Amino acid sequence: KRYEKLDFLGEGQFATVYKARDKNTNQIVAIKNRTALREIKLLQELSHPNIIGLLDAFSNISLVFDFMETDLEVIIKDNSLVLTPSHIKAYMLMTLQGLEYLHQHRILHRDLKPNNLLLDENGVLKLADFGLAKSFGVTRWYRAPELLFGARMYGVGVDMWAVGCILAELLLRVPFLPGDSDLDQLTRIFETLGTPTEEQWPDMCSLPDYVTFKSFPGIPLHHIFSAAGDDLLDLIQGLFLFNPCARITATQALKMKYFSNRPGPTPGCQLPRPNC
Ligand SMILES: *CCC(=O)Nc1ccc(C(=O)Nc2n[nH]c3c2CN(C(=O)N[C@H](CN(C)C)c2ccccc2)C3(C)C)cc1
Fold first, then answer.
1. Closest residue by Cα to residue 239 from 142, 148, 154
2. Level-2 CATH architecture, domain 3-66
3. What is the effect of changing residue 32 to M?
4. How many CB atoms lie under 10 A from the CB of residue 107?
5. Quick one: which of 5, 196, 208, 233 has the fewest CB in 10 Å?
6. Between 2.40.50.1070, 3.40.50.300, 3.40.1160.10, 1.10.510.10, what CATH number should domain 70-270 receive?
7. DSSP state, 14?
């Protein structure tokens, strides 16, 4: 009861979400089970500016997170907005910084997609929905080629491919590889980026469900991302490498010249806030 609800925010799988002012602090919050009670454990553990804060939780349960004004899917979907190189850079920086933190804490998100990359009123992006997240101990369109094949030994490359997919959608403003089966998703990856050889991939055929695909050459990235410079083409190139050992980590992505080159990232206050 330490909170009292103000506005309905949504329905879904896990309970309903409700906007509230916390009685004591006057701060505004949002208020949400083995598949959820490991999520409750995991999120009260962590603290990062770019990770959703689980503030309280208390079986019929309600889980107080930060309140978030919007998400990247809204921003992507919104025609009233133009994204500038500096908005994109700021968005990918916060995404990757939040990710780097999780992966140094030996956690995979496994459900990166733009509707999970929430934003506050002060332009701070926070990764949300750790219901698929697991310790090292996603929907088709952000899913890595290896996962579509059938790899269960898999790593950070799973989350890194999705970041490429989200990055492309920041640029094109449309899903990059929008497949309508798990095979159509491989068909789409291999016509756009080219069919990987086993020189593009050392132990590929050892996958239980590796399959002999049509040998496409792919579209060059400069044709797809025409407005991107060589520094951002290298970021996109790194994220989309088929070998999950070659594929760039959040850390290698963040030490990439792209984030140190001009134009720099937009401050949160000046990131494009939408209306409903
Ligand atoms: C102007 C219109 C507008 O911006 N509307 C709007 C404002 C705010 C929200 C909102 O839900 N805010 C919010 N604050 N903290 C949270 C949220 C949503 N949320 C979730 O966890 N939501 C997830 C949805 N995933 C797919 C990102 C959810 C919700 C229910 C069940 C499962 C998953 C938290 C609690 C982080 C919405 C619209």
1. 142
2. 2-Layer Sandwich (3.30)
3. No effect on interaction with HINT1
4. 21
5. 208
6. 1.10.510.10
7. S
